[model samples]
Target: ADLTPKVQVYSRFPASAGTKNVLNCFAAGFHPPKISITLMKDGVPMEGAQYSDMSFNDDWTFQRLVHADFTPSSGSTYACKVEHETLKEPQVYKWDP
Candidate 1:
């Protein structure tokens, strides 16, 4: 068996206080490995989204820390997308803001 793409999000966001949220992804068994990350807010994709997808080592694990601007706009959903080579499926991660 191989390790699949894993994602995680840390809640504990302060209301109205701009904070940097971290999004990390781990993928294994990918050939010609690469990963793409994206952030979405309130079911909408953020404009000028920050992401990085470059050649990865043979270890097949890629991680990224994204600074998400915190906005306390009631209950909202924050999502992160992780795309990797050899895997056509995009892993979607969601968090509450």
Candidate 2:
């Protein structure tokens, strides 16, 4: 099976106070599969954030979903990353706020 990591971010409420966004990652076909989601603000990593862990509800697929609160200090640029154990490589994506 071809193992690849996929990620998607959905918008939840425009930039506002006390709102959260979702980060979703899907990884498949790796032994001891894992995923790491990083949120970067202004080219720097966000610290002390709450998140979920890698979970499986079906065969051959694993996922991690996280909700991050909107912070005014996060600047206008954000990035997300996902790493897979078998691939040893990570997928990165960037977006503008």
Candidates in order: C-alpha RMSD to true structure:
4.2, 3.6
TM-score of each: 0.56, 0.65
**Where does model 1 exceed 4 Å of error?**
1-3, 12-33, 47-60
lDDT of 1 by residue, 44-69 (tens): 76664444544455576544444444
Per-residue lDDT tens digits of candidate 2, residues 1-97?
6556566654454554345554323333443555667766676766655677666646666666655655543436667766667556776676544
lDDT of each: 0.54, 0.57
Which candidate ranks first by lDDT, i.e. highest? 2
Q: List the residue pairs that clash in candidate 2.
A: none
For candidate 2, the lDDT comes to: 0.57
Following a full C-alpha superposition, what root-mean-square deviation does model 2 have from the true structure?
Answer: 3.6
